[PDB]
Design a binder for this molecule. Sequence first.
Ligand SMILES: C[S@@+](CC[C@H](N)C(=O)[O-])C[C@H]1O[C@@H](n2cnc3c(N)ncnc32)[C@H](O)[C@@H]1O
Ligand SMILES: [Zn+2]
Ligand SMILES: [Zn+2]
Ligand SMILES: [Zn+2]
Ligand SMILES: [Zn+2]
Ligand SMILES: [Zn+2]
Ligand SMILES: [Zn+2]
Ligand SMILES: [Zn+2]
Ligand SMILES: [Zn+2]
Lengths: 10, 373, 497, 10, 132
Amino acid sequence: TKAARKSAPA
Amino acid sequence: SWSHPQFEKCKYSFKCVNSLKEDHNQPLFGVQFNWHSKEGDPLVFATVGSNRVTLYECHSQGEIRLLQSYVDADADENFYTCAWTYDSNTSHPLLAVAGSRGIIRIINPITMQCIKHYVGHGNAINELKFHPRDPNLLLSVSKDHALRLWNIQTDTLVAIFGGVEGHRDEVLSADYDLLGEKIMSCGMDHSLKLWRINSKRMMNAIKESYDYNPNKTNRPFISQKIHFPDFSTRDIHRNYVDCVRWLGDLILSKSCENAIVCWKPGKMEDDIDKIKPSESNVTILGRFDYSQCDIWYMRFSMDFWQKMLALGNQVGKLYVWDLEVEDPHKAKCTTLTHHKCGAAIRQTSFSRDSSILIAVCDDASIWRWDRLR
Amino acid sequence: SEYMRLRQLKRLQANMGAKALYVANFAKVQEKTQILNEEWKKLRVQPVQSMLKKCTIESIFPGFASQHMLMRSLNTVALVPIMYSWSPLQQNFMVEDETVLCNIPYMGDEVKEEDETFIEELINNYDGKVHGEEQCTPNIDGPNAKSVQREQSLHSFHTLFCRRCFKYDCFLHPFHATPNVYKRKNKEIKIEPEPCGTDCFLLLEGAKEYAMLHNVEAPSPVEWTGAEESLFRVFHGTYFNNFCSIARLLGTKTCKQVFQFAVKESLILSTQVYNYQPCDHPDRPCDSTCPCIMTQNFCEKFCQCNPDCQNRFPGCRCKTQCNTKQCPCYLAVRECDPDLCLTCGASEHWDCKVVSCKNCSIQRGLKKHLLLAPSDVAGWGTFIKESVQKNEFISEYCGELISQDEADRRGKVYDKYMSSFLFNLNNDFVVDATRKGNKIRFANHSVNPNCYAKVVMVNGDHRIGIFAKRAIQAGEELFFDYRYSQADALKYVGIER
Amino acid sequence: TKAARMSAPS
Amino acid sequence: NRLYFHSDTCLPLRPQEMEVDSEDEKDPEWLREKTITQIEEFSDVNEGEKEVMKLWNLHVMKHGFIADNQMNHACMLFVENYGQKIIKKNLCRNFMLHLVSMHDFNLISIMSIDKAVTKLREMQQKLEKGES
Ligand SMILES: C[S@@+](CC[C@H](N)C(=O)[O-])C[C@H]1O[C@@H](n2cnc3c(N)ncnc32)[C@H](O)[C@@H]1O
Ligand SMILES: [Zn+2]
Ligand SMILES: [Zn+2]
Ligand SMILES: [Zn+2]
Ligand SMILES: [Zn+2]
Ligand SMILES: [Zn+2]
Ligand SMILES: [Zn+2]
Ligand SMILES: [Zn+2]
Ligand SMILES: [Zn+2]
């Protein structure tokens, strides 16, 4: 479902 | 952190002796100790981040001294990886660096200048690795879905690994086995692929790359285009595989699912060198459970003797496992934390003697952990 | 009921073997690292010493003062454009639709609801399927050969051979679920006039009469191996009662022996284009129900209809180069058939340098030498090595042949990443030069281009040809009109030099 | 659903 | 007037390399390995049929035969080139089956089968003479 992110959001 | 209760703490212990912070304040994506440093010479490591590649010297009482500092003329360059090697003939240590642009640069720190440069990769370079027995053979994985093996002595492209049965998406990491006979690669396509470089085709290609003389010929160096791996699996992880290292004949690999898996191609009994490229089986020996490592591009590392494994997570925690165990499920762990360290740890590096552990973060900080005698 | 102990027993068996393996492997690890460590002690690499714009490295631990160093600039390097891995192809490679999405394409770490929606609709095109989401006839040449029927001995060849490509398990065409393809149309029925002939079957009393009757005798004792028997049934179906030749082909049996075995065996038992698929309705002729008539295509040499069928394209009697509307094949947007066009020279010149019929270029792969270099407009471009005249064939646009659904599934992420290699071939297929293709794939879009595309029917296959729109000088970059919508042209291929 | 494709004059 | 590049390795082109085309090749090596491994995947096809099919496929790929009229020549050309390997790999019976299948497919005549088998035997005796 969700795509993996390389870095944290804020 | 797993199904096998470990009551005893890890035999190795560390304490934080220093923390530096680079002025650019951008993520430090790579850190390597120069394991080619002569015995007795000071421990030297390098860090890549933003468009910079700076070198450091380790001293007693936790002092880290700034040796060298480089910057790319190109502002839009973002370095991700680095690899140490030495020039066989002159005995100068060289540092290879690469990042978003997809260019490998060889820096000669003895002469303070960028000697070689290789442009060919179609996109960013996610990992650079030198052959453990041939210091001129450099391996580069890439966002273009390919691996390239370069002969830096003759500036030739020995082979391209990729194509018909190569990675469908970015190649995040790769590692040569102990004596550099094979490479295990991994990527966004959730898969781990084996590539043998001791094959007649590859051995001959390496031999030929050394014989190539542009001055004495009209034709270009024919690179091997290897489309078919010697094994491939997708049954270890269920997400982007961002880190892979050989534990001799077994594989240690991680995705962004809070575990390092210790597996092997084929059934339990099956020998690595008797593995048919059609092999549909894999065997799990063990797991290394941890927490909060949900982002991809987080690399673990081992020492020279492969006695200990280190990994940083997205909240600044560092885990060190003692691999010298009987059951891989019972590896003891020492978890290093610091009240001022809370940034994502991108990569770790042990000195060749294993006395110092360095960890680089997303806030341009460096952390120095000294192993207790 | 209590399966728990047998499942736990297998867990216990595994755990013991795993520790034994891990320990033995760690010994090998220590042995190979000692070898590497020994090679290290032999070398004496020089230690790195200390050293525009400055850099400041601040320590967070008290007692360590901030450090400054004047930054060494790294020389500028020549940058080459972006390009993901691809494989060379000179003819279209057919590819089955994917069931499970390989992995989620990475596209940043930002908080976009529209981007999270895109990932949901991408998964839905595969139907929630994303990786990670919640008997054989024995060999006749071998020692284990059986006595088998002709139909059974030839089954793999008949099944796997492509009549069109001339190759087994071709990468272009799907399997001909009709057996009339491997049914000989013109039977070669013969009987030798004079004996071969010391052991000829014609010397046997009343044998020639029997031979003419199929299309008494005498006994004379032979031991047939299963392989000899099977080879006989195979040759008998093609040679018939020409026992002189069947014996010669067996080699291991005499003409009389072969004949005597044959007797023994006889006392046993409008804008849109549609894809072309050969017709095979063995009783009804080519009418409104024939697939060829339905899809508005001609019946071909591959069709199983009666040879004197009106739907069949007849080729040409041209004595020209077939490069003008004066040639029927050219007029019909077809390349000359090497087995029908017998006057123009399309049927020959296989080893010649100049071909007499200029309507053969695609099938013969007579493409020009293309050069790859960074484009003056966008990314990488295709440059022509040598000067070409107007309407001269340059190259076929080759690639993976995919369905329209597969094209939209792939195209979904292609358009998000702002780069596409999809090229519509017909109503059934899309040519996708993304993963496999040739140098003409780098041709850029121009509203005023120097090249044009044309989908031509080439020997029962639609093929995209790229021709010169005008005369092109050597070294020129090639451009063609992509024919995107008015909106898509500005969105993806907007740059005009 | 329909993704962009290059096209030839039919 | 500009710097060209190799399409395989994205590396540049020295002036002396412009006379050869990397894509002047009908049968790329990956394509050849692809047919060999696809033929090998067939569980229902025996060892002898598989080996013949692989050889034949590599032969038509190398030459690029496109017309039915080329099939008599293609069969003879096959015996001439791959014939030594057919005898060596013990495949004559499966080759004859391939020939008969081509006849069933209406691509070759009985003269073609006779000619091809005569050449195969003539070159079998030639090898035999040398292995003595
Ligand atoms: C078939 S590829 C052409 C080769 C491509 N330029 C490359 O470097 O890989 C088509 C894609 O290239 C880009 N492109 C092609 N022609 C263009 C143009 N005239 N202006 C801008 N981008 C263009 C767009 O991304 C388009 O979808
Ligand atoms: Zn076919
Ligand atoms: Zn006879
Ligand atoms: Zn019909
Ligand atoms: Zn018809
Ligand atoms: Zn028809
Ligand atoms: Zn004509
Ligand atoms: Zn014609
Ligand atoms: Zn013609």
